[PDB]
Amino acid sequence: MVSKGEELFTGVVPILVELDGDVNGHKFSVSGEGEGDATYGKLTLKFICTTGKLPVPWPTLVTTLVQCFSRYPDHMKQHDFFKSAMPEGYVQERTIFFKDDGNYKTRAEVKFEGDTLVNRIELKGIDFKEDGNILGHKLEYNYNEHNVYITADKQKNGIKANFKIRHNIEDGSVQLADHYQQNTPIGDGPVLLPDNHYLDTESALSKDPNEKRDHMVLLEEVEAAGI
Ligand SMILES: [Ca+2]
Ligand SMILES: [Ca+2]
């Protein structure tokens, strides 16, 4: 393989996710667990809002809640920054602007701890409207396919990304969420700095009929493209 970290993804890998959030002073925690199969770009996760009712819609947290599981095609293996940063991992930071509403600011560390890929995140949301699409829970429980556009940031030894999520609203409108992303390695080992490309990202949301807690089951399928 072209990076040592890529070797950690040839099988099925257990995933743990932990998020601490505060949106307009509404504090919440989310815990997720599942597994990823990067050979196929697939992962399966179940998330619980452990603090009670989630005060924002689940779809607004999908991008925040492990792009190391993307499938890079064989001719694109030299462009996979994410796996190359493993096991020590990377910091992923975003600002997410919900058009005509508030924003999320997130900082996460994605790294291996033993056999498990862990994504630990802090989220702060501000300036949301209490009767808007987010705090009013007006988003449909569904998700569109989107391209994540990646470029190298050679002075941070990392990458940048930007993309625009389109969230369907229950009355037929759309809520746009403009994402700005930066990733930086945690360790000092060499990483792969990619040519421009994108991640073709599909997400499917569902429920577990036996889970009484507020929760989201998420299936993702992601493949790199564009070289
Ligand atoms: Ca597509
Ligand atoms: Ca596609």
Query: How many distinct structural domains can be found in the chain?
Result: 1
Helix (H) or strand (E) holding 84: helix 81-84
Q: Nearest bound ligand to CA 223? A: 2
In 3D space, the residue among 14, 68, 43, 95 whose CA is nearest the CA of residue 192 turns out to be 68
DSSP 81: H
Q: Where are the alpha helices (DSSP H) in 92-168?
A: none
Terminal Cα distance for the chain, rounded:
19
The alpha carbon of 202 and the centre of ligand 1 are apart by a number of angstroms equal to 8
The alpha carbon of 174 and the centre of ligand 1 are apart by a number of angstroms equal to 19
The alpha carbon of 146 and the centre of ligand 2 are apart by a number of angstroms equal to 8
Return the C-alpha torsion angle 152, 189, 35, 118, nearest 10. -100
**CB contact set of 148 (below 8 Å; sequence gap of 6+):** 67, 161, 163, 181, 198, 199, 201
> At what resolution in Å was this solved?
1.2
SS3 79: helix
In 3D space, the residue among 165, 200, 166, 159 whose CA is nearest the CA of residue 181 turns out to be 159
Domain that holds residue 76: 1-227
Contact criterion met (CB below 8 Å) for 3 and 80 = yes
CATH number of the domain within which 125 lies = 2.40.155.10
Q: Nearest bound ligand to CA 41? A: 2
- Which technique was used to obtain these atomic coordinates? X-ray
**CB contact set of 9 (below 8 Å; sequence gap of 6+):** 36, 38, 39, 68, 69, 83, 86
The alpha carbon of 204 and the centre of ligand 2 are apart by a number of angstroms equal to 13
